[PDB]
Amino acid sequence: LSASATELLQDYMLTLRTKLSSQEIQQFAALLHEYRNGASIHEFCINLRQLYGDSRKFLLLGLRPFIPEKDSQHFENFLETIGVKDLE
């Protein structure tokens, strides 16, 4: 884990602490843990979208480097599809 990845991780955790409610933190922890234990990237994206909707764009963009290589393309397609990079 590089120094830059370390920085990104710290930044992400801080942003989570600043932005999310206890409930949101619990839900994200749950769905992320499910994905970590072997659940599909598809279900991960569904759960993320159900959690954030069109909001929390920063937190979705920040996940991209963390997505495993084999699931990265699906995640990018997801972000592009739901319009995370589209402000208006």
């Binding site: 884990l1 990845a5 991780l9 992400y12 955790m13 989570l16 602490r17 206890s22 933190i25 619990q26 994200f28 922890a29 992320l32 843990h33 994905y35 970590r36 963390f66 997505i67 495993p68």
Partner: peptide
């Protein structure tokens, strides 16, 4: 439990790379 959830999140984020 919120702190534990945060620790879980960080741990899982690291684990996805390992």
């Amino acid at each position: 439990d919120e702190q534990e959830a945060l620790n879980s999140i960080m741990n899982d984020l690291v684990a996805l790379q390992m």
